[PDB]
Design a protein around this ligand. Structure first.
Ligand SMILES: O=c1[nH]cnc2c1ncn2[C@@H]1O[C@H](COP(=O)(O)O)[C@@H](O)[C@H]1O
Ligand SMILES: O=c1[nH]cnc2c1ncn2[C@@H]1O[C@H](COP(=O)(O)O)[C@@H](O)[C@H]1O
Lengths: 208, 208
């Protein structure tokens, strides 16, 4: 159902390091988990450097990141790992999503490379999902982290459309919405995305 | 919901290597998945040697094993990782379940060591679960394996009772049954165990 030590029992807060220094992600999560008694703090506030993302799956990377933060802070740790996985490319860009076009990758060059890679893919074989894996480790050596995996299916376009969001959003067409992820508003994207799903799953698993 | 390539579509069979040479596990799984069109084969039939279990979680080990088999056979791969996690010991024996008492570990010496480790644990603080994590990788570099995690709660006894099963069964008391895992029959244990749960989850995720 999932074991003890994920929430405090329980007038006090439990401090939990989030494995990012990203203030937006930290604000979002601290705000959601607040009510469960979790005091969420960026790993950067506690002097944690970036972990080397050496895993070959989102789950392995999320766990590696969470473990590094927990090991350096001696706190329980939450991490995420996210990316785009294209069926016809066996799940690529996958764990190489952020760095797909190499050293000096940028969002645009990443997406442009994905279009080039997919230029001869038939129109009906362009399925893809964004994935967000969240993990929660009680301590660095916890053998049974909670793991929350959200995903969001779409289809890769042939040209970019829209300027909202980030990353591959301009080429990720969402047939249920009749537009790309970058044409959605932030509120509209948040309601349906892989990250929205994984947060819902997490909040719901901590209820429990 | 979970992506393509886990079942064939679909008069043919898809061969899938199970990451064990254990004939009982292979018979059980081949028999369950048969109907879904999966042709399950022990990794030992295909000449796969044991992978080094280097991960610090059941999920990391199950994935490592599945990836090694898939990489050596070029087949999709299923693996499991299982063990006993005791709350008061932070999840130990955990990934060291099979080897808990070291080099030349046996079931009995493992369990006897767990009793010694837990001898001063109050009677009401002896919670534990067995965990079984099953994973299914489409190929060695698949970034989004299916992951099925079953667990089974119990309480660690102060003495062994019963001679059925294996491993820590003689000291894992199951309050809903009023006996230890080793006092259950094989059919009774199978119906409720961490492995029973993970198989149910897998069979149900392949339905889908
Ligand atoms: O919502 C999203 N839209 C577009 N691309 C994303 C999204 N989430 C993850 N990605 C891609 O996956 C990478 C994930 O790295 P992270 O954002 O560092 O976790 C990002 O750099 C993007 O390349
Ligand atoms: O059903 C069970 N009963 C008792 N111990 C188990 C069970 N499943 C896993 N274990 C323990 O966890 C280890 C798991 O290793 P595996 O059986 O090699 O997957 C076993 O050697 C036992 O030590």
């Amino acid at each position: 159902h999932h074991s003890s030590g994920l929430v405090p029992r329980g007038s006090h807060m439990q401090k939990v390091v989030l494995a990012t220094g990203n203030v937006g992600k930290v604000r979002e999560l601290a705000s959601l988990l607040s009510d469960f008694g979790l005091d969420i703090v960026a790993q950067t506030d506690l002097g944690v450097d970036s972990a080397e993302e050496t895993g070959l799956t989102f789950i392995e990377n999320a766990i590696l990141k969470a473990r590094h933060a927990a090991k350096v802070t001696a706190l329980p740790a939450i991490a995420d790992a996210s990316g785009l996985a294209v069926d016809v490319l066996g799940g690529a860009p996958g764990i190489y999503s952020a760095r797909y076009s190499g050293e000096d990758a940028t969002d645009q060059k990443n997406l442009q490379k994905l279009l080039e890679t997919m230029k001869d893919v038939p129109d009906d074989q362009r399925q893809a999902r964004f994935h967000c894996v969240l993990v929660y480790l009680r301590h660095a050596e916890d053998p049974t982290p909670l793991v929350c995996h959200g995903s969001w299916p779409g289809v890769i376009t042939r040209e970019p459309a829209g300027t909202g969001g980030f990353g591959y959003d301009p080429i990720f067409f969402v047939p249920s919405e009749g537009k790309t992820a970058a044409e959605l508003t932030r509120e509209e994207k948040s309601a349906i995305s892989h990250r929205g799903q994984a947060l819902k799953l997490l909040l719901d698993a901590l209820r429990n």
